[PDB]
Design a protein around this ligand. Structure first.
Ligand SMILES: Nc1nc2c(ncn2[C@@H]2O[C@H](COP(=O)(O)OP(N)(=O)O)[C@@H](O)[C@H]2O)c(=O)[nH]1
Length: 255
């Protein structure tokens, strides 16, 4: 009845959390026509909640079969929640994916894992500035697991209304606004920002997927051409640097 997608960087403790949450209620198979493990399970302590594991990834690029599975599933609306496993010992770099996950429009909850090793992070202030709930967990000591599962189960597409996205530089936002206004009804409302950023990056999968008119296509090219002159960097590099700047600010404001 509530579908939670478990994802995060490799070696963030995702398997460990997944096994604790689901116990031996796990199903193993594969993603259709792709050589990638598919696993899921019911939450041991609440069988109305189901965890869909997703391959560990650093980013949602179009080049990797794992990343495409991650993306295709999150943009398919099967998930009510994303429970983002984050390595607290390497916070900033893990948040690179976190920003992308928020952009899908499926509400994110962060299991701030490996908190035991970390023994400075202000959980309440980190949650405030990222705009997602954050629960310190330890898969080793088995702390915060039930708490984060409970937060995620109550942080869904039907409970969350004001979806707070990472706001970037005015000059990138202008280009995203212009792309959203161009796209209009040609993409889903929930994940509109995800698609706009991807079109701005000239993402092969997204271009091939959307039936965009010549009118739409030409406006998006203009927007991209101009924004590259305003920033003096290529579209991809603009988005990469803006993601890290947003991560660098948020971490400054909360340690
Ligand atoms: N100290 C500590 N180790 C953890 C924690 N979570 C996972 N690990 C350890 O990290 C290593 C990799 O764990 P794993 O679940 O496979 O990470 P992944 N690859 O994201 O599934 C294992 O040795 C596991 O015991 C944690 O919260 N604290």
């Amino acid at each position: 009845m509530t579908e939670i997608a478990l994802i995060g960087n490799p070696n963030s403790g995702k398997t460990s959390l997944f096994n604790l949450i689901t116990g031996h209620n796990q199903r193993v198979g594969n993603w259709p026509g792709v050589a990638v493990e598919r696993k899921s399970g019911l939450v041991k302590k609440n069988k109305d909640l189901e965890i869909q594991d997703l391959p560990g990834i650093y980013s949602m690029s179009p080049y990797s079969p794992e990343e495409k599975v991650a993306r295709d599933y999150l943009l398919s609306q099967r998930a009510d929640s994303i429970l983002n496993v984050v390595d607290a010992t390497n916070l900033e770099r893990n948040l690179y994916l976190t920003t992308q996950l928020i952009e899908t429009g499926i509400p994110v909850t962060i299991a701030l894992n490996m908190i035991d090793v970390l023994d400075k992070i202000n959980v309440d202030k980190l949650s405030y500035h990222l705009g997602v709930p954050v629960v310190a967990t330890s898969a080793l000591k088995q702390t915060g697991v039930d708490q984060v599962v409970k937060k995620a189960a109550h942080t869904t597409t039907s409970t969350v209304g004001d979806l707070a996205f990472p706001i970037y530089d005015d000059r990138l936002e202008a280009a995203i606004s212009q792309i959203l206004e161009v796209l209009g009804n040609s993409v889903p409302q929930r994940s509109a920002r995800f698609y706009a950023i991807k079109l701005f990056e000239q993402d092969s999968l997204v271009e091939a997927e959307l039936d965009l008119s010549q009118f739409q296509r030409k406006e998006i090219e203009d927007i991209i051409r101009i924004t590259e002159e305003i920033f003096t960097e290529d579209a991809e590099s603009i988005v990469i640097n803006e993601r890290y700047a947003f991560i660098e600010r948020v971490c400054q404001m909360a340690e």
